[PDB]
Every structure is written in C-alpha cells, then in structure tokens.
Design a binder for these strands. Structure first.
Length: 1335
RNA sequence: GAUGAGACGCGUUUUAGAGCUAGAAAUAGCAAGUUAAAAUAAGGCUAGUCCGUUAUCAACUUGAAAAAGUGU
C-alpha cells in the first residue's frame, strides 16, 4: 500500500522515482487525452525533468540602470532647453526644431537642412572656423566678444550632456587631484599595510616622472629607478604599472597557482580584482583603490596638457593634422601602391578604417606599425605611436578620468563672459550650473510615485521633482530610513536580525577571537600542546592586537611569551607565519580620533557600532554629516571632519544577536563568551553551532512558497530546480491517489598535486625526480602519485620501491573500508604488500609505526601527507580507533552539511506535514530524508550498478531511485539515527551510545553504515567476515534488506527501458533582438529603431528573438489572381511582437497576411515542444525553423556496465583480486562492442536520420576494430553524442571528426503528433496535427 | 548567495560638415578626415525625472486575477 519518493535535485534536471515496500517501481495505466486513437499508456513511475538553467538578474539590472541614466540625461538637456527657450525664439525660431530633426534624412526633414545656422554659408563658415566643439569652447571661455546665443547653447549643452564623473567629492584641490599627493597617499596606504619593509615618499619626484610625455613602461622604469629597495616586478612596481595603464600580473607577488592579470581600463576589472581580493584577503582593498585614484590623476594629467581641456584637444587636433599630412606625403613618396588601401579603403584597419570603418586606436596602431617600420623615414611618428598621443580623437576612452568640476568650470567661464550681454544667462547662471551639478543620492533611489517595484523614497511635496527644488521636496530622512530598512540583509542563522557591517568592531573582535582560540602552544616544560585559555588570549589581544595592526609570530613569541610567560623557546601549532585576523577599523579610527579612552570604555561600544554602521550604509556627504547630530558633542569638532571622510564598504554574514546576543539556556554564556574562555579544550564556531549538548543548535532551528524559495541561499538556477522538485512531488502525490508517501528522500547533486610533490621532494633528498623524471601528463595515477608522495619508498617497510614493478604493489587504506569509506590520498598509502600493515582489523600495527614513524614525520614536514594522515597513521600509538572516532565516522557518512538541502527538506516537510494532534504538536506523517551523494555513488560502485552520463538522461532517474532505496533502507535499519538525517525534532540518542566497544543489541562495531548491503565484509587482514542473507532490524523485527531478491529488484528497475524524460517547454524571454544597430539597407528584414524611422533610410536591428512559434490554419493569396489557397504554417512570434499578438491574435495574423484564420486551431508552441512522427521518432521545436533530437537511446544495462568497466581499465577500486577479474570480464566480452555499435546503428537509422555521419562513423569504427578494447570503449562513449537528446553537436571518434547534422526543416511537424506532457510525463495529451487543415 | 540604489566614458546608427580638377559622361587623377545633434531595447499607463531583457509558464475546464479543478 505505502510508497516513497526518491529525488535528485539539480540545476538542469530533477530526478524522481516512486518505490514500494518491496523496493519496486510501480507500473500504472494513464489516460491519454487529445484527439488521437490512443487512450491509455502503461508507464513506470520513474523519470527525470530537464530544463534550461535559470539566469541571474544581473544583465537585466545593468540594462535597467542604463535606461534610467539615458532618461535622466535627456531630461537634463531638456531642462537646459527649457531655460534658453524665449530668447532663442527671439534669435532663431527654429533652432531647437532643427536640433530634434538632426537625425532625419533631408526628405523627412521639416526645416532647413543645416542644424546650427539654417544657411549653407554660415554653417560651412562655422565648421571651417571651429573644426571641433572644443575650439568653440575655448573661444567662448577666453574671448570677451559677444557671441551667437546658439553657440552658447551648443557649448553649454555639450557640457551638460557629458558632465564628467563624480568620483572626487567636493571641490577640486591638489590633495585629491594631483599625481604627487595621490602617490604619497598610495605609499602611505602601502606602508600602513606593512610598516616592515616600508616605502619613503620624501626624495621621490613622482609628479614629474608619471606625468611626463613619455611611454608608460618608461615612466615605470623611471619611477622604480628612484626606489632602490624595490624592483619593477615588485608589488609596488605592479601597483604603479597598473596605475599607468599597463597590465601587471599579481601571480608572482602573491604565490597563487593561477595568474591574475589586472587592467584598470577594462570592463572586467572589477570582477578580476574581486577574485584577487578573494585569494589574498580584504586587507588589500584600499591599496588597489588608491592605485586606481592615482591612475585617474595621471590620465587627467595626460589630457590637461580658462579651458585647459579644450586647449589640449585643440593642440591634439593640430598634431593630428601635422602627423597626418607628413604621413600621407611620406607614403606617396615611398609606397604609392599602398596609399589607396590605407586612406580610402574602409574595410581595412587604416585611417579610413580608424575614421570611417570603426577600427580602434589599438587596431589602427597595430595596422600601420609594420608599414612605418618599413618606410624608415618615420622615427618620430613611431615615437608618437606610443604614450597615447598620436592621431588621437578628442572623444575616446581616457575621457573617463575628467571630473565634473572641470566641465562645471568651463561652463562657468562661458556663463560669466556672456553674462552681461544676456540678462537671462545672468539671472539663470546658478540654475544651469545646478543642472550640471546635481546627482541623485544612493539612499534616495528612483524618484517614483508608487509605480516602481524597486523604489522606496518619500516626497515632501506633490510637485514634479527637479534639480532645483530637489532639496526641500525629497524627504531625505524618511528615504534614508527606508533605504536602511531595505538594504539590511538578515542572517540566515538568525532571521529578523540584520547583519553587522564587515568592518564593525564587534565583528573584528569576533573573527580575532575565533582564529586565536584555535592556537595550541607547546613547550618542553609542558607535556602536550593545549590551547591558550582566557587570560592568555585576552592578554595577547590587549598588548598586541590593540597596539599593532599586523601581528608577527616573532611579535607573538618574543613580545609576549618572553616578556610575560617567561618562555624563552616556544612552538606555535595553531597559526602559520602570521595572523590572518586583524583589528583594522580599530587602529584606523584610533589614528583618526587619538582617544584610547572612548575606545576601550566598553560603554561607548554601542556608539561606535552605530558610527561605523552609518559609515558603511551611506556614502552621500550630507547624510554622513547628519550622523554627527547625536555625536557632535561627544567628540571634538576638529576630528569630526576626518571622521566624515572615512568610509567603509562591505557586509558581514552574522548578526549581533547571534554573536553576542543569543546565549545557552543551561550555561548562560553567549557564543562569544563561550568562545573567549574555554577549559583546556576549546570550542570553535564550527562546533558550537551544530553541537547537541548546547542550546545554540535548537535555537537556530526556530509564508508563501515563493518566499520560502527566494529566502534560500542558492543560485537562481538551483531555486528553479527546487521549485520544479516541489511540483514533481505534488504531481506524484496526485498520481498515487492523493496519498502522501512514507518517505521522501532528497539528494542534491590541478597543478596542486605537482606543486606539493615538487615542493615536498625539494624539502628532502630530491634524487627521486632527477632519477625518475615526470610531468603532470603522467598526472594523478594513484600509484605513481603516491610513489612520489612517499619518495619512492614503502610506507610500511624500509625498502626502495621500483617503478617498473608497480603492478605488483598494492594500495592500502589507513582507516579500513570497514569503518569508513574514504578513497582519497588522505587515507591511502602504497606498499609492496597490504599485509605489511600488520594483522589488526584496526589501523596499522604498533610494530610498524614504532619502526616507521620517523619516516612519516619526514614526510609530514615536506607537506607530503597532511596532519590528518599522520594522525591516522600513528593511531596505534594511542590505542587505535575509539568510540569517538566511530561516532565521528557515522556523523561524517550520514550528515549533509550543505544548508540549502536542510532548507529544501524543511520546505517539503512544511508542505507535506500539515496536521496537528489533540495537543499542539506536529503530526509527522511524512519523513523527509536527506542523503549524501557519496552513499548512492559508492552504492553504485560497490555492487556494479555503474553510471555513464554520456549515454542518455536516465541516470538522473536511476539516481533518484537508488536514493529512495538507500534512503529508506537506512531509515529502516538504523531508526535511532533519525535526527542525524531525517528532518524534524527527534531524539539525539547520542551516536556514541549506539556503537559497540568490542564484538559481541548494538547497531554496529564496524562503522561503515553501508555494510549491511553486503554478503561479505573484507577486513584489513584479508579476514572475510560474513553477514546474514537477510538483514533485519532488532528492536522492531522489520526486514530491511534481502541480499538475494532486492539486488535483483534494483538491477531490474535500472534496466527498464521506459523512463519518463520530459524537457520543460519554455517561452523565450529577453532582448528583442541582437543589440548591434545595423547600417541602412534595402531590406524589409531590418527592424525600426523607432516607430517612424524607416530602416531602409535610417537603419535598424537584425535577428529578432522568437518567444514561441504558433500554429496557424488559414488561407493566403496566391498569384496575380489573388486566389485563396488554404495553408497550414508555422509562424514565430518574436518577443517584440508578443504583447501585440496575445492582445489580439486574429488581427495580428490578418495584418500578417492571413485570411479566414481558424481561431480555435491557433496552437501555442513554446521551445522544446515535442512531436512524435513515424516509427517512434521524435523531434523538439528549437525555433520556428530548426529541430532538436527528441529520442532517448535506452542501452541495456549490461552494455552500460561494460562501457564503464572498459573505459575505466585503470580501475582504482579497493581490491586487486577482483579488479583483474573485472579486466578479464572486459576482455572476455569483446563482441559487446559490435553489439553496442549495432544498437547505436539501429537507433540511428530509425530516429536521428543522419545517413552521412552514421556511414562515416561506422567505417571509422570497423577500420579500427583491431584497436585495444579500452580505446574503442571510450570512443564509443564519445559516439553517443550522435544519438543524445537535444541539439546536434559535433563529436570526435578516434581521429575522424563527425560534424553535427542539423535539422533545418521544420515542416514535418505540421503533420506529426504534438505531445503535451505534464511535469512527470505520466499525463499526456496528444494532438494529431494532420487532422487539422483547411476544409 | 542571491537581490537592490547612484554616476561616468566609449561604441553604434542616421543627419550636418558645399569635395575639387579634367572628360559630354561613364570614369579616372587629386583635396580631406579628428566634430556635433539625436536615438540608444519598439514602447507602456499607472503619465512617475516611473516602468519595459530576472523569476514564473504542458493540456483542458472554471476565474478579471491569486488560483482552484480534470486522468483507477
């Protein structure tokens, strides 16, 4: 009667299976709706949903913001036009109208063809006089002559539209703008980050060197030449090299495995810096920020060589002229044959390309460099083709550096000069400047009025907000409050409680204590290294951490242990080299206020937390400044400004109430209190939280479905997978007659080796690598890798191994397969005979460790083995395996650490368990189990239920099934261990209590909980223990596993050829088209950029994106007779067209050219709609004009296992006795290849229909029949890409590359059967489209 | 580990920047070029200095919609 659901949640699929008490997969009959002759199908309740990955809302956000900016910029220019209106109407009635219509061709143009003046003569004159806008800007700033009001507008507009950046806050002065001051600022931050090996900025004239009109690398060399202790490739060297615009690599500066090459002038820089900071710490932020600021200062110095900008651009125009004329002259002089290509052909990256073709400065310089090197009359030109000042346009990328204060300046100059000639410029000068100056603050957000899902702000008036009445119309206070209310992230650990800023004092204390409390100190006077205890820790903090930003091991041992704990010789085992933790904000704000009194007062702590909070949330000057209102008196008004200048960015992961708020029920000590001072054995935040002895865990445990999902901490993709999972379960509940299941099992699916082995072999006699060379091509073959991690010696006996005889040697497990399944290197060794470990069922013998420990420690120093491996190798020296270690093994094997999974299990529980008893207690009908993937995967490998993902999509379903099997079998065999994997408030039962101290009620002595599936249990000795044929639970009498029948049942389920694979059908969403604006062309294919703008004249977009195709049955006109021919067509509705179509489809279709449309036969066909054709061949709809493979090749499980085994000829299992037999199983079945290729062939000939590629791959197969079995196998695993579901893709078989075979015709589906599938695929609705037509 | 607010600078597309000599023209010889306006998802009603590329979506039935139903 009862049943269970097994699930395998993924980002691209959801596996699901239904099982019964005998571990069988039911088969049922389902109705088939539609209009075919089929009315029922028999289907197995096993299957998998497939779906495209969910996307992150970023690109959508970037677009949103960019849109906002364009509207607001246009609004600016519209303000400026609003001011100049009347007087311009007095001067030129149709100036602005000429401006709007600047775009239109002369034909569509209502007014005179020339925008500025309205006459050919005045226009040509104007352009001849001022070849650029900058000339005119300079003339308008420097001359006292009255000028045409139109040129006033044009200048002011060209300065208000493009109003420069706003990075520098307040007015411009040398302290924030000049190369030198920012250089000493940079070195100040660097020195602050080190203080040891510092840099002096005293004798360095950086202002002259960095701003010199010489190349970047030259300025680099010149600067590092002034620094003797530093090299060009140094950290500082790469910082300046970064600031000049070069591309330094920080791989060498910080010993990373991967290279990290930064370049400020790239769009991807922000993220690359993010990765760099991820790998080296958040201590280096201000440094790189300073480096950037310096870069902008340098660039601004390169462009500003009154109106300095306009002037320099003018000089640039002139230089461009001189160098161009000289260039052309020289070219005609030396190569007249190539002049026509360089100055006329736009298709080439020449000047004709640089100006008309669309090439960039870089492409241009790349093009003409070899020519200039071939002409040899061009040395100064080549000199110019560097340093970024040759043939330059006035508008390029460097222009980002120009602050808004420059433009405000020149704008103000022009405004002052013509101030007297026009009273309205005088009266409205501050208005204009405000238009240029005003910038909406972060905390304000979109100036909405209730119709924005993003905005929050509040208005003081009912007026349209302008840059002039902004200040007293926006409720800055309420808006800031709401801004706070929104931006506060809550702690996942503690909801309803916001998280501390990443730079809060409490947070820094927290991380310091957390990293410090795990330090163990050892001295000769003491027996063994233990922790520091409270007095010592607080002492180290008080003396060291609040006097120094960076703490050195030398500073720890010599400036504490030597001067307090008397210890002369100490050894620290807790931390390496230095402390990662720090008290940065403490020391920075200390340097700010210079008042240790308020700092350590502990009463002022709250006030400080509020101060740093405000400094983190906001960045606007005024809102920052309002944060002095409560704290103006408490501090001297002098220091206060320096406090306002300090800004902190970033957020923590933990709240206040979690760190120092919530406290244990019993002990009454909070997390921080219980962390600061423990007894001899210290507790970490990793072990305080999930501990069952304390209140914390139970405290952590204590809305709509959408909210439940969105609150989760996971990618939008996995949230998609999770919603699909919930839906699948709901439908499966519907299929089983609305009966909820017993159980729902959930599963959620390198040079480092070479580095460690070369470093490690370097720490010792490195003769092994010099005598036996090896590259990472030999990679990580286990036995070789271990042969090198062990210096070519036996880990158990003192003897020098041989490379040529590795196949005789076997790998052994430190903690045997009987206790814990661990196949990593951290639990594997290499020896001539596994018998050399000893004769114990436990860890290797005492005889061995006592005779080999020295060697092991030798390996430990060389970091060849980790602490864990050394500990587990020398465990007989402490007895062996204990009860704590076994309880540990259980908790390791059984607990899923991932929090997303616990929250998904919580969701399904909250959905399935809805009934309450006579008390007020949760009636728990359905048990939601959580599985680790290692369980089912190892279960596969143990009993040869092998997985080969490349064959078909069944493995998802098989995985959900096996998840149900192992999950429920575990809940039946070990019910006491429920609270460790089943979701809910159960009893803990203290795992330690469930394990036997020695053999012969207890659950197990051998802690591999997955032992009871086996008939035999092989021990370290080779001693083969035996187990019942039928496993049953003691205290219940229930039978859990029949090692005879149930494996046959599983093997049966996995081999069922009918699995419900369903691909979620999806309306396409996104951009209307490709984003490139194409030149005007005589085609009716281009899309209008604006309603009226005919693309044949103005250009437009290409390649629109189709939302979904639609089936239309109607008639069209054919011939000169315009006779109605009835047709049935597949029409794609594009994303742009969609709103209009769905609003009223019949008029859309009639306007499209269709007459007498069958409204009831308009069938919506989303992407991946399924069509079945002849012989059971299927196709999915990819667009309105291409199809995808729709069938699944169900390869018999024997072939699958054969392919797994043969492809893994180098099988690293657990035994070498069975492995050889596996290899013999491969060699014995060589006909299997031929059979497999026969299956692939039959399937191919029937459903994929690619005759060419099949013939090619068949010939290429039969030709290589004499090739080894392993090769043929893995190549066939490739060959499966011919038959795979989805889009055709190219694949390689041996050397022969088989190109993809697309299905470009879409018509065949018009007379096929549309199959509407539910999410399980169990419910179908089949529509015969050949029955539909024009009567 | 997702989600959000502010701003810049490129790019691109049309248009304005009279091309000149011969030759009747076709077409060849040459002169040049660096700038600007405008748009920057078509657009939307809720008309905001707002919103418009995420999430969500088999079929059928009932609903304006949220969403309920339908198949041993």
């Amino acid at each position: 009667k009862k049943y269970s659901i097994g699930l395998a949640i993924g980002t691209n699929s959801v596996g699901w299976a239904v099982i019964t008490d005998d571990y069988k997969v039911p088969s049922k009959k389902f109705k088939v709706l539609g209009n075919t002759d089929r009315h029922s199908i028999k289907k197995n309740l096993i299957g998998a949903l497939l779906f495209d990955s969910g996307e992150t809302a970023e690109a959508t956000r970037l677009k949103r913001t960019a849109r906002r900016r364009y509207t607001r910029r246009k609004n600016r220019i519209c303000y400026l036009q609003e001011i100049f209106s009347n007087e311009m109407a007095k001067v030129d009635d149709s100036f602005f109208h000429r401006l709007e219509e600047s775009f239109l061709v002369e034909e569509d143009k209502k007014h005179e063809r020339h925008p500025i003046f309205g006459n050919i003569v005045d226009e040509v004159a104007y352009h001849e006089k001022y070849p650029t806008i900058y000339h005119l800007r300079k003339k308008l700033v420097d001359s006292t002559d009255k000028a045409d009001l139109r040129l006033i507008y044009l200048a002011l507009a060209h300065m208000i539209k493009f109003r420069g950046h706003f990075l520098i806050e307040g007015d411009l002065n040398p302290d924030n703008s000049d190369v030198d001051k920012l250089f000493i600022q940079l070195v100040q931050t660097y020195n602050q980050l080190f203080e040891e090996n510092p840099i002096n900025a005293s004798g360095v004239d950086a202002k002259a060197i960095l701003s010199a009109r010489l190349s970047k690398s030259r300025r680099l060399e010149n600067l590092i030449a002034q620094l003797p202790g530093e090299k060009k490739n140094g950290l500082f060297g790469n910082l300046i090299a970064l600031s000049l615009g070069l591309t330094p690599n920080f791989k060498s500066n910080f010993d990373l495995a991967e290279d990290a090459k930064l370049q400020l002038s790239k769009d991807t820089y922000d993220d690359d810096l993010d990765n760099l900071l991820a790998q080296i710490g958040d201590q280096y932020a201000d440094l790189f920020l300073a480096a950037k600021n310096l870069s902008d200062a340098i660039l601004l110095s390169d462009i500003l060589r009154k109106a300095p900008l306009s002037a320099s651009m003018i000089k640039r125009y002139d230089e461009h002229h001189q160098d161009l004329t000289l260039l052309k002259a020289l070219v005609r002089q030396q190569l007249p044959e190539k002049y026509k290509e360089i100055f006329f052909d736009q298709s080439k990256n020449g000047y004709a390309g640089y100006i008309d073709g669309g090439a960039s400065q870089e492409e241009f310089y790349k093009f003409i460099k070899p020519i200039l090197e071939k002409m040899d009359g061009t040395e100064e030109l080549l000199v110019k083709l560097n340093r970024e000042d040759l043939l330059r346009k006035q508008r390029t990328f460097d222009n980002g550096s120009i602050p808004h204060q420059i433009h405000l300046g020149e704008l103000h100059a022009i405004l002052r000069r013509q101030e007297d000639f026009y009273p309205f410029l005088k009266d409205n000068r501050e208005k204009i400047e405000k238009i240029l100056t005003f910038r909406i603050p972060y905390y304000v957000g979109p100036l909405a009025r209730g119709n924005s899902r993003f905005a929050w702000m509040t208005r003081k008036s009912e007026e349209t907000i302008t840059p002039w009445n902004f200040e007293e119309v926006v409720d800055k206070g309420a808006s800031a409050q709401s801004f706070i209310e929104r931006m506060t992230n809550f702690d996942k650990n503690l909801p309803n409680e916001k998280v501390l800023p990443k730079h809060s004092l409490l947070y820094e204390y927290f991380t310091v204590y957390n990293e410090l409390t795990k330090v163990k100190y050892v001295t000769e006077g003491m027996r063994k290294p233990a922790f520091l205890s409270g007095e010592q820790k607080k002492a180290i903090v008080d003396l060291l951490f609040k006097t120094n930003r960076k703490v050195t091991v030398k500073q720890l041992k010599e400036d504490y242990f030597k001067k307090i704990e008397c210890f002369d010789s100490v050894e620290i085992s807790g931390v390496e080299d230095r402390f990662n933790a720090s008290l940065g904000t403490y020391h920075d704000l200390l340097k700010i206020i210079k008042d240790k009194d308020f700092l350590d007062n502990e009463e002022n702590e709250d006030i400080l937390e509020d101060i740093v909070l405000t400094l983190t949330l906001f960045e606007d000057r005024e809102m920052i400044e309002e944060r002095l209102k409560t704290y103006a008196h408490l501090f001297d008004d002098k220091v206060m400004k320096q406090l306002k200048r300090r800004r902190y960015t970033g957020w923590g992961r933990l709240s206040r109430k979690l760190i120092n708020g919530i406290r244990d029920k019993q002990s009454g000590k909070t997390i921080l209190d219980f962390l600061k001072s423990d007894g001899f054995a210290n507790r970490n935040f990793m072990q305080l939280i999930h501990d069952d002895s304390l209140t914390f865990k139970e405290d952590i445990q204590k809305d709509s479905l959408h909210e439940h999902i969105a609150n989760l901490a996971g990618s939008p993709a996995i949230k998609k997978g999770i919603l699909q999972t919930v839906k699948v379960v709901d439908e499966l509940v519907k299929v089983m007659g609305r009966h909820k299941p017993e159980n729902i099992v959930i599963e959620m699916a390198s040079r480092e080796r070479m580095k460690r082995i070369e470093e490690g072999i370097k720490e010792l006699g490195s003769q092994i690598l010099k005598e036996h060379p090896v590259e990472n091509t030999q990679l990580q073959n286990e036995k070789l890798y271990l042969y090198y991690l062990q210096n070519g010696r036996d880990m158990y006996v003192d003897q020098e191994l041989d490379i040529n005889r590795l196949s005789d040697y076997d790998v052994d497990a430190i903690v045997p397969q009987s206790f814990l399944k661990d196949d990593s290197i951290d639990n594997k060794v290499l020896t001539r005979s596994d018998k050399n470990r000893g004769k114990s069922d436990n860890v290797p013998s005492e005889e061995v460790v006592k005779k080999m420990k020295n060697y092991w420690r030798q390996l430990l120093n060389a970091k060849l083995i980790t602490q864990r491996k050394f500990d587990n190798l020398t465990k007989a020296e402490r007895g062996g395996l204990s009860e704590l270690d076994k309880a540990g093994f259980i908790k390791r094997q059984l607990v899923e650490t991932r929090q997303i999974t616990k929250h998904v299990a919580q969701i399904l529980d909250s959905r399935m368990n809805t009934k309450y008893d006579e008390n007020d207690k949760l009636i728990r009908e359905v048990k939601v189990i959580t599985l680790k993937s290692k369980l089912v995967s190892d279960f596969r490998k143990d009993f040869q239920f092998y997985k080969v993902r490349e064959i078909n999509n069944y493995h998802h379903a098989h995985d959900a099934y096996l998840n149900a099997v192992v999950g429920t079998a575990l809940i039946k065999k070990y019910p006491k261990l429920e609270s460790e994997f089943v979701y809910g408030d159960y009893k803990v039962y203290d795992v330690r209590k469930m394990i036997a101290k020695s053999e012969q009620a207890k659950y197990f002595f051998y802690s591999n909980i997955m032992n009871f599936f086996k008939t035999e249990i092989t021990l370290a000795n080779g001693e083969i223990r035996k187990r019942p044929l039928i496993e049953t639970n003691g205290e219940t009498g229930e039978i859990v596993w029949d090692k005879g029948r149930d494996f046959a049942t599983v093997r049966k389920v996995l081999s069922m050829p009918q699995v419900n694979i369903v691909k979620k059908t999806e309306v396409q969403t996104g951009g209307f088209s490709k984003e490139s604006i194409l030149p005007k062309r005589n085609s009716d294919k281009l899309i209008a950029r604006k309603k009226d703008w005919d693309p044949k004249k103005y250009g437009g977009f290409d390649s629109p994106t189709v939302a979904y195709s639609v089936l239309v049955v109607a008639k069209v006109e054919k011939g000169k007779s315009k006779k109605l021919k009835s047709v049935k067509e597949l029409l794609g509705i594009t994303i742009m067209e969609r709103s209009s179509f769905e609003k009223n489809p019949i008029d859309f279709l009639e306007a499209k050219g269709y007459k007498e449309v069958k409204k009831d036969l308009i069938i919506k066909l989303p992407k991946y709609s399924l069509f079945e054709l002849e012989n059971g061949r299927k196709r999915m709809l990819a667009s309105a004009g291409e199809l995808q493979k729709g069938n699944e090749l169900a390869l018999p499980s024997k072939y699958v296992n054969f392919l797994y085994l043969a492809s893994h000829y180098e099988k690293l299992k657990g035994s070498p006795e069975d492995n050889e037999q596996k290899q013999l199983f491969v060699e014995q079945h060589k006909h299997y290849l031929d059979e497999i290729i026969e299956q692939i062939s039959e399937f191919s000939k029937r459903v994929i229909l690619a005759d060419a590629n099949l013939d090619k791959v068949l010939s290429a197969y039969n030709k290589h029949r004499d090739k080894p079995i392993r090769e043929q196998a893995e190549n066939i695993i490739h060959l499966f890409t011919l038959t795979n579901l989805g889009a055709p893709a190219a694949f390689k078989y041996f050397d022969t590359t088989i190109d993809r075979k697309r299905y470009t015709s879409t018509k065949e589906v018009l007379d096929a059967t549309l199959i509407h599938q539910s999410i399980t695929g169990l419910y179908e609705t089949r529509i015969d489209l050949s029955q539909l037509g024009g009567d």
